Amino acid sequence: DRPTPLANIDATDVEQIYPIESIIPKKELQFIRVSSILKEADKEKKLELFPYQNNSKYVAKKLDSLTQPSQMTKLQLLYYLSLLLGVYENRRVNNKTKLLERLNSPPEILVDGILSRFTVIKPRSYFIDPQNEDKILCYILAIIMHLDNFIVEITPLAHELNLKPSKVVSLFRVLGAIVKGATVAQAEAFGIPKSTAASYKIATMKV
């Protein structure tokens, strides 16, 4: 129905607005295997294990922070983000066979899950309509909200995702995030000049 994951209307903490269950069904989770990524010492080899190889800037940046077994769930979300990004960047592909050729051997059930929930079957051959296209991006952005602890800098993210900054702003607003300039406090934390912090856009979720 909506391009966003199903919100928890009773949420009292930002973490609960978009529960993990809303982003990835519980049944699809045992199939996101991240132990090898966590154990692999070489960053190049870690990156090679991701389901989409078109050198995601976001994945490589975010990887450096996900090193402990307590962060396994976050690492599964990053793996899934990579797959969704692969489906989005290859949105013009209309069949499962060509799609798999553009991807780095993800478990087939995850691809099936994406095709059944983010595409329409042509009356097998499929179509990603304009709404399903934004749905893919909204789930990517809901993941980023979990991974960046509900405070996101628009400008580096737009660059990392190869998306127009105004599209990132617009989609974060569709997700219910507040998008405005950084406070002098946020400027100190983010290491951005205080005098123009108002022009540096930040997306935040609130309860």
Swiss-Prot record:
Task: Summarize the impact of K164A.
Answer: Loss of DNA binding
Instruction: Note the effect listed for K201A.
Output: Loss of DNA binding
Q: Which domain of life is it from?
A: Eukaryota
Annotated compartments:
Nucleus, Nucleolus
Q: What effect on the protein does mutating K167A have, as reported in its record?
A: Loss of DNA binding
* Cystine residue pairs: none
Quick one: effect of changing S166A?
A: Loss of DNA binding
Q: Where is this region: Interaction with DNA?
A: 130-207
Q: Belongs to which family?
A: Belongs to the eukaryotic RPA49/POLR1E RNA polymerase subunit family.
Q: What does this protein do?
A: DNA-dependent RNA polymerases catalyze the transcription of DNA into RNA using the four ribonucleoside triphosphates as substrates. Component of RNA polymerase I (Pol I) which synthesizes ribosomal RNA precursors. Besides, RNA polymerase I has intrinsic RNA cleavage activity. The heterodimer formed by RPA34 and RPA49 stimulates transcript elongation by Pol I. Subunit RPA49 can bind both single-stranded and double-stranded DNA.
Share what the entry says about its subunit structure, partners included: Component of the RNA polymerase I (Pol I) complex consisting of 14 subunits: RPA135, RPA190, RPC40, RPA14, RPB5, RPO26, RPA43, RPB8, RPA12, RPB10, RPC19, RPC10, RPA49 and RPA34. The complex is composed of a horseshoe-shaped core containing ten subunits (RPA135, RPA190, RPB5, RPO26, RPB8, RPB10, RPC10, RPA12, RPC19 and RPC40) where RPA135 and RPA190 form the DNA-binding cleft. Outside of the core, RPA14 and RPA43 form the stalk that mediates interactions with transcription initiation factors and newly synthesized RNA.
Protein name per the record = DNA-directed RNA polymerase I subunit RPA49
Source gene?
RPA49
Please give the range of the full-length protein represented by this chain: 185 to 399 of 415
